[PDB]
Amino acid sequence: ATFEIVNRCSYTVWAAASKGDAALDAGGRQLNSGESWTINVEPGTNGGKIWARTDCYFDDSGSGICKTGDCGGLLRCKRFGRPPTTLAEFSLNQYGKDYIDISNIKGFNVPMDFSPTTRGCRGVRCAADIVGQCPAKLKAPGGGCNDACTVFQTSEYCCTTGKCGPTEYSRFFKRLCPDAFSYVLDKPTTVTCPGSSNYRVTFCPT
């Protein structure tokens, strides 16, 4: 499956793509404002994620640091990124169907549209100014808007026991982005697409 990753932000981002225990495609790449990076994701990939990283430095070996979304200091991500990260999430070819969503469960750093480029389903978007409106207690000094599990480490925010309800903090993300997951047991905003669809992830779509 092909994912076109487009940076419409006025600032550089370092795109990242991982399924948690391995890179997807090259795993990461710099995207200056306006640049597009097309990656190939193996059919059947379960639990893949694409995200933006901001304010990165990398040396000639591809090692360094990012202020949001850092994946163990690597340009080419093999693991998931450090919150806060707006997440494009997907599982492909699951009994004939693809499943996609956007999630704020690990916070928000960059606005994002996640849309199919092939027929049969709709896209999702979280493009509100979540960082500008972020509750004071959730603001990440390094940049972005942390989720409340990252900040407070409670069973209720992290849904540790598989029982948890919405919270003042989850309702903040949900009010600004109704079509993204705001907490672990949120009413699902997952979109079912035809198996083997292709996609585009656009940072700063508006």
From Swiss-Prot:
Keyword Signal assigned: yes
Localization of this protein: Cytoplasmic vesicle
Alphabetical list of PROSITE patterns matching this protein: THAUMATIN_1, THAUMATIN_2
CDD domains: TLP-P (cd09217)
Disulfide bonds: C9-C204, C56-C66, C71-C77, C121-C193, C126-C177, C134-C145, C149-C158, C159-C164
Any one cellular-component term (Gene Ontology): cytoplasmic vesicle
Main localization, broad class: cytoplasm
Keywords linked to the UniProt accession: Cytoplasmic vesicle, Disulfide bond, Signal, Taste-modifying protein
Keyword Hydrolase: no
Pfam families recorded: Thaumatin
Function: Taste-modifying protein; intensely sweet-tasting. It is 100000 times sweeter than sucrose on a molar basis.
PANTHER family in UniProt: OS03G0233200 PROTEIN
Family: Belongs to the thaumatin family.
Protein name: Thaumatin I
